[PDB]
Amino acid sequence: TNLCPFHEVFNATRFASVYAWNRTRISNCVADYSVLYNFAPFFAFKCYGVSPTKLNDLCFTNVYADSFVIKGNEVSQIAPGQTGNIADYNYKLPDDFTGCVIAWNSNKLDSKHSGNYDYWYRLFRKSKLKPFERDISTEIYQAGNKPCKGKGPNCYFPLQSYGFRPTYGVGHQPYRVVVLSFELLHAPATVCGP
Amino acid sequence: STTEEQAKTFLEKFNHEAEDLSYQSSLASWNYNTNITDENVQKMNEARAKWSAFYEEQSRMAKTYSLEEIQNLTLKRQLKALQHSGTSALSAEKSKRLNTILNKMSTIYSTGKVLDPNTQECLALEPGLDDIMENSRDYNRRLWAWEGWRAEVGKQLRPLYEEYVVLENEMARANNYEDYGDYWRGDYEVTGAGDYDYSRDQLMKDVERTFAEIKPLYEQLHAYVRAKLMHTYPSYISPTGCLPAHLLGDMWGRFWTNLYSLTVPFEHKPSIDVTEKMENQSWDAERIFKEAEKFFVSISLPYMTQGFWDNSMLTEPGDGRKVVCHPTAWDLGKGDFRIKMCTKVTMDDFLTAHHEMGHIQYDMAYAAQPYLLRNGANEGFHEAVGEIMSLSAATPHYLKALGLLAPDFHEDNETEINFLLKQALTIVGTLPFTYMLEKWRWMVFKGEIPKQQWMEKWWEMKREIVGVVEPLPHDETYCDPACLFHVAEDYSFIRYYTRTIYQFQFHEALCKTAKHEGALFKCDISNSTEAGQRLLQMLRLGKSEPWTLALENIVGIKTMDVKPLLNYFEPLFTWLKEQNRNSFVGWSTEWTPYSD
Numbered sequence: 001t002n003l004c005p006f007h008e009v010f011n012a013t014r015f016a017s018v019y020a021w022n023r024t025r026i027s028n029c030v031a032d033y034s035v036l037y038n039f040a041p042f043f044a045f046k047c048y049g050v051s052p053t054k055l056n057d058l059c060f061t062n063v064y065a066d067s068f069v070i071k072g073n074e075v076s077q078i079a080p081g082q083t084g085n086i087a088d089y090n091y092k093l094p095d096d097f098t099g100c101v102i103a104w105n106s107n108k109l110d111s112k113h114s115g116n117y118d119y120w121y122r123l124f125r126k127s128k129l130k131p132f133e134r135d136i137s138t139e140i141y142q143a144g145n146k147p148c149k150g151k152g153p154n155c156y157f158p159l160q161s162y163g164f165r166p167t168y169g170v171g172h173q174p175y176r177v178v179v180l181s182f183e184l185l186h187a188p189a190t191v192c193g194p
Numbered sequence: 195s196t197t198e199e200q201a202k203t204f205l206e207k208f209n210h211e212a213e214d215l216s217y218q219s220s221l222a223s224w225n226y227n228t229n230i231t232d233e234n235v236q237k238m239n240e241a242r243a244k245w246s247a248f249y250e251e252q253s254r255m256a257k258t259y260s261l262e263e264i265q266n267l268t269l270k271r272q273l274k275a276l277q278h279s280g281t282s283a284l285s286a287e288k289s290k291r292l293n294t295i296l297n298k299m300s301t302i303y304s305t306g307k308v309l310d311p312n313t314q315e316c317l318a319l320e321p322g323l324d325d326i327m328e329n330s331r332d333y334n335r336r337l338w339a340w341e342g343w344r345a346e347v348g349k350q351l352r353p354l355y356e357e358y359v360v361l362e363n364e365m366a367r368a369n370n371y372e373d374y375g376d377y378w379r380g381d382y383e384v385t386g387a388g389d390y391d392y393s394r395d396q397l398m399k400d401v402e403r404t405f406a407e408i409k410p411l412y413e414q415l416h417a418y419v420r421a422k423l424m425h426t427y428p429s430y431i432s433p434t435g436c437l438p439a440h441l442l443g444d445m446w447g448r449f450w451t452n453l454y455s456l457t458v459p460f461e462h463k464p465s466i467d468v469t470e471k472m473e474n475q476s477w478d479a480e481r482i483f484k485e486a487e488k489f490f491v492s493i494s495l496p497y498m499t500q501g502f503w504d505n506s507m508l509t510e511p512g513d514g515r516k517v518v519c520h521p522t523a524w525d526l527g528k529g530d531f532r533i534k535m536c537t538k539v540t541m542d543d544f545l546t547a548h549h550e551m552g553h554i555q556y557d558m559a560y561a562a563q564p565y566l567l568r569n570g571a572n573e574g575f576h577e578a579v580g581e582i583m584s585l586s587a588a589t590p591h592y593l594k595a596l597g598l599l600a601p602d603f604h605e606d607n608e609t610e611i612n613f614l615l616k617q618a619l620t621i622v623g624t625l626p627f628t629y630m631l632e633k634w635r636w637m638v639f640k641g642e643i644p645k646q647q648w649m650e651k652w653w654e655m656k657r658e659i660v661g662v663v664e665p666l667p668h669d670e671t672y673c674d675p676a677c678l679f680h681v682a683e684d685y686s687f688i689r690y691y692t693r694t695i696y697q698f699q700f701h702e703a704l705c706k707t708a709k710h711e712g713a714l715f716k717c718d719i720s721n722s723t724e725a726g727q728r729l730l731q732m733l734r735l736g737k738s739e740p741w742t743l744a745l746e747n748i749v750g751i752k753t754m755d756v757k758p759l760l761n762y763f764e765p766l767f768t769w770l771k772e773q774n775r776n777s778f779v780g781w782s783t784e785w786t787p788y789s790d
């Protein structure tokens with residue numbers, strides 16, 4: 001009965017933003033899911049490929065948990081087949097994804113008077129993303145056909161800053177979103193429930 | 195590869211960085227509004243300097259984008275808002291001359307003090323003149339005071355105003371505007387919208403048509419004003435000539451609200467007064483704002499988020515810290531909206547609370563829109579949307595429904611007559627004066643009048659339009675109308691006119707959707723969520739598409755109209771047309787009080 005570090009993935013102090021998908025791997029665990037229920041009042045618990053209550057009777061090979069920080073709108077934006085500045089340039093979720101998404105608020109915890117400015121996201125890449133892709137691409141982005149050293153005339157920097165402050169009302173109060181990814185593939189199933 | 199995408203990317207940036215900087219600046223502004231200590235003064239002097247520097251740099255960078263190779267209308271208007279260089283188009287010397295003279299008016303108007311012939315009493319514009327006018331009825335005190343204030347404020351601010359006119363004409367000609375009047379006209383400019391395009395002179399023709407449709411009303415109400423005032427003061431006002439300037443109820447004739455005590459038709463009926471019932475139930479700021487929330491829920495608009503109640507100051511924070519609490523609420527954004535306004539246990543505070551809540555609801559309505567569009571579709575929507583809520587809450591039907599007025603009560607005839615007079619003299623008194631200051635600033639920037647008869651033409655057509663006569667003749671060595679606040683600090687005035695007409699247009703449309711029958715001044719938007727959705731259909735729009743489409747989304751008419759103005763005061767105007775059967779209608783321009 002070796003419990004899995006769901007507590008140590010859900011109780012960190014610097015959940016990396018969308019731009020470092022911070023993906024943790026799950027194996028040789030027991031998937032206690034009462035912690036997935038009692039922990040925080042939550043704000044988004046949409047499950048797509050797995051029933052949200054008939055899931056403890058399943059045994060999985062591997063589970064991938066990604067750990068970010070987004071604003072209010074992007075929480076609803078995270079979904080299969082979606083568009084926008086977070087669903088196409090920083091984190092893209094495959095249409096055939098089967099799992100659950102977790103998103104619960106954190107302000108007292110992550111905002112800060114004076115403000116946060118570490119969670120950094122991306123806005124303009126050359127092309128479209130592929131699902132489950134990291135692209136820390138610190139490449140002064142360009143356009144205008146005058147590719148440039150950058151950060152200047154039509155020379156932009158890919159990243160941006162999340163101004164986070166403890167008074168922002170809901171809509172952009174820094175939410176903490178972590179996505180649970182499963183796969184129902186024939187293999188030696190190692191992560192079973194009690 | 196095309197300019198459209200490059201502009202979109204630059205807009206993305208401007209959006210995000212401007213959001214961050216503006217949130218910083220406005221949060222520190224709120225820190226002013228509550229904690230006025232010397233250090234925070236510095237803090238957002240640097241913060242505003244940073245915000246202005248970012249705005250200037252972003253505009254300079256955006257100037258490389260041509261508007262001839264861009265098609266998306268949202269992008270069109272975002273870029274056009276970016277490209278208004280304003281004062282930066284001129285030379286550095288001219289810009290610093292402009293801003294230093296701006297600072298000079300600020301200082302002079304904020305510090306203009308008048309010494310009485312006994313110099314002992316040092317008095318200011320506020321609250322001294324406000325008290326003197328709205329409290330005292332003496333002719334001599336009013337005349338001496340206002341004449342002295344005019345005679346010293348002009349003496350300092352006349353050539354300053356002349357050089358303002360010169361430099362602003364130069365700036366407008368620099369920015370491809372014929373005159374600075376066209377610069378203030380540019381706000382209503384909409385292009386690239388079929389069936390929705392509007393020029394700069396089309397609104398001028400609209401306003402002239404509103405004159406053609408409104409004149410008899412104001413001539414007629416002026417007739418009662420003079421008749422009642424000559425009943426109170428027979429030897430000082432002619433029965434046919436115009437009313438003299440220093441008898442309009444306030445500092446510069448803008449509001450006739452103080453003329454109530456002398457112009458109430460039936461002084462024995464009781465006016466709607468619920469304050470007593472406020473201390474009956476011991477209502478408070480939390481309770482009054484919660485009542486406002488119940489109202490706005492009854493129109494299906496969304497709630498106040500926890501941050502509102504948690505962080506905004508809602509009642510005066512004792513005497514240790516000083517707060518200037520003119521009812522205000524600016525757009526921090528990201529849901530983080532807040533209000534400071536000193537809450538006393540009164541009805542004026544109730545009306546201002548509903549007005550500010552209209553402001554807040556409108557401001558949250560376009561929260562998802564980009565930064566350059568997070569504003570009212572024109573400058574006159576925000577205040578009108580705020581004031582319609584106050585007007586709706588002012589009816590006694592709402593007071594009965596919420597239990598703030600005794601249910602064993604029926605709408606009383608001569609009391610509601612006084613009530614219509616209340617909302618009449620607080621509104622229509624502003625119209626001709628606002629119209630008219632705005633027309634003079636138009637012709638000043640147009641240059642149709644030379645330097646040497648400004649005041650003469652001012653006061654002659656003041657006699658012929660507003661029916662106002664100088665009780666002292668003044669020569670070209672005067673700049674009397676500059677003494678007002680907004681003219682002293684470079685804001686437009688059609689905002690007040692657009693507010694006034696648009697609010698009645700919205701109220702007409704909403705009460706038509708509310709299916710209210712009977713007297714229109716008794717209409718209430720309560721438990722009318724279909725009307726709430728109708729309003730929200732425009733509320734969410736912001737500046738993305740032209741304001742006339744938003745106006746149609748409520749009324750269905752692409753242009754402003756006078757019909758709500760006419761219809762709102764109809765039974766009122768019947769009572770008055772039957773009352774002027776024994777009094778002269780119209781004024782003579784020749785009579786002046788010192789022409790004997």
Ligand SMILES: *[C@@H]1O[C@H](CO)[C@@H](O)[C@H](O)[C@H]1NC(C)=O
Binds near residue numbers: 011
């Ligand atoms: C995180 O861990 C600490 C102790 O390490 C605990 O006190 C705290 O409650 C945990 N966080 C939550 C949200 O329970």
Ligand SMILES: *[C@@H]1O[C@H](CO)[C@@H](O)[C@H](O)[C@H]1NC(C)=O
Binds near residue numbers: 225228229231234
């Ligand atoms: C309140 O005023 C004090 C002045 O003593 C200042 O130091 C402090 O920063 C102010 N607080 C806020 C929130 O503005």
Ligand SMILES: *[C@@H]1O[C@H](CO)[C@@H](O)[C@H](O)[C@H]1NC(C)=O
Binds near residue numbers: 266267268
């Ligand atoms: C114009 O801008 C809007 C808002 O960003 C967007 O939805 C629309 O697709 C744009 N149109 C074109 C042709 O790019």
Ligand SMILES: *[C@@H]1O[C@H](CO)[C@@H](O)[C@H](O)[C@H]1NC(C)=O
Binds near residue numbers: 470471474
């Ligand atoms: C309200 O006023 C006081 C209580 O504040 C008291 O007379 C009574 O409860 C109410 N009615 C009147 C007429 O005052």
Ligand SMILES: *[C@@H]1O[C@H](CO)[C@@H](O)[C@H](O)[C@H]1NC(C)=O
Binds near residue numbers: 720
């Ligand atoms: C709206 O409905 C509520 C529901 O009881 C009622 O209390 C209130 O008086 C109504 N307001 C009106 C009819 O103006």
Ligand SMILES: *[C@@H]1O[C@H](CO)[C@@H](O)[C@H](O)[C@H]1NC(C)=O
Binds near residue numbers: 606607608
């Ligand atoms: C006004 O209403 C009163 C109700 O008290 C009624 O007696 C009167 O006839 C009505 N009309 C006038 C002109 O007063």
Ligand SMILES: [Cl-]
Binds near residue numbers: 446447
């Ligand atoms: Cl005047």
Ligand SMILES: [Zn+2]
Binds near residue numbers: 521522
């Ligand atoms: Zn206001």
